[PDB]
């Protein structure tokens, strides 16, 4: 039975229930994430920005089944074209807007990676990606408004690949956390 999360804390409790087993009902997880109405007071602790690039701030470790984190995107900050290491990845906007550009997995032959589609993700909306859907880039294209998003990955992963848009060549990258549970983790 899926109920509306009343607060971020309630959302976390609900997620622990939805991930108690060995599989993931993607549509139910997406629905509960969408239903949580972003309340900035509840997540201010995690919203730690860096001047030069987007930051990843761990909120909950999901008793091992998932990581829930808040990403903070300065004006003009974006990601690489990347995969998600055989994990489910949910993205919900808490503040601002992000542009998501989708790409196909490259062929082994070196070639320009052409965009398959793009969309604008708006406040409170929840998107989903996995490697079977494709690769993506996420960017805050705003010149005036920082963006904040809530991300859930299951299983957790701390490495992925970044893809060179001009060739499709990939490189392994290790992901780091700017903070964990509200504490800066240099």
Ligand X SMILES: N[C@@H](CSOO)C(=O)O
The reply on whether position 138 binds ligand X by CB under 6 A is yes
The reply on whether position 80 binds ligand X by CB under 6 A is no
Residue facing ligand X at closest CB distance: 91
How many angstroms separate the CA atoms of 23 and 183, rounded?
31
Whole-number minimum distance, CB 84 to ligand X, in Å?
6
The reply on whether position 29 binds ligand X by CB under 6 A is no
Task: For residue 82, say whether it is annotated as part of any ligand binding site.
Answer: yes
Task: For residue 161, say whether it is annotated as part of any ligand binding site.
Answer: no
Whole-number minimum distance, CB 109 to ligand X, in Å?
26
Size of the site for ligand X (CB under 6 A): 8
**Binds ligand X by CB under 6 A, chosen from 47, 59, 91, 93:** 91
Residues engaged in binding ligand X (CB under 6 A): 56, 71, 79, 82, 89, 91, 138, 151
Binding-site residues for Fe cation, in ranges, read: 82, 84, 136
């Amino acid at each position: 039975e899926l109920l509306k999360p009343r607060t971020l804390a309630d959302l976390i409790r609900i997620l622990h229930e939805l991930f108690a087993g060995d599989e993931v009902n993607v549509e139910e997880v997406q629905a509960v994430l969408e239903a949580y109405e972003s309340n900035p007071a509840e997540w201010a602790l995690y919203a730690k920005f860096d001047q030069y690039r987007y930051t990843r701030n761990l909120v909950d470790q999901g008793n091992g089944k998932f990581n829930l984190m808040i990403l903070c995107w300065g004006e003009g900050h974006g990601s690489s074209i990347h995969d998600h290491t055989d994990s489910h990845c949910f993205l919900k906007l808490l503040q601002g807007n992000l542009k998501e550009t989708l790409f196909d997995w490259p062929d082994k032959k070196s070639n320009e990676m052409i965009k398959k589609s793009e969309r604008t993700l708006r406040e409170n909306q929840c998107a989903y990606i996995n490697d079977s859907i494709g690769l993506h880039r996420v960017e805050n294209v705003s010149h005036t408004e920082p963006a904040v998003s809530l991300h859930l990955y299951s299983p957790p992963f701390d490495t992925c690949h970044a893809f060179d848009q001009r060739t499709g060549h990939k490189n392994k990258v290790t992901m780091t956390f700017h903070s964990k549970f509200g504490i800066r983790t240099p």
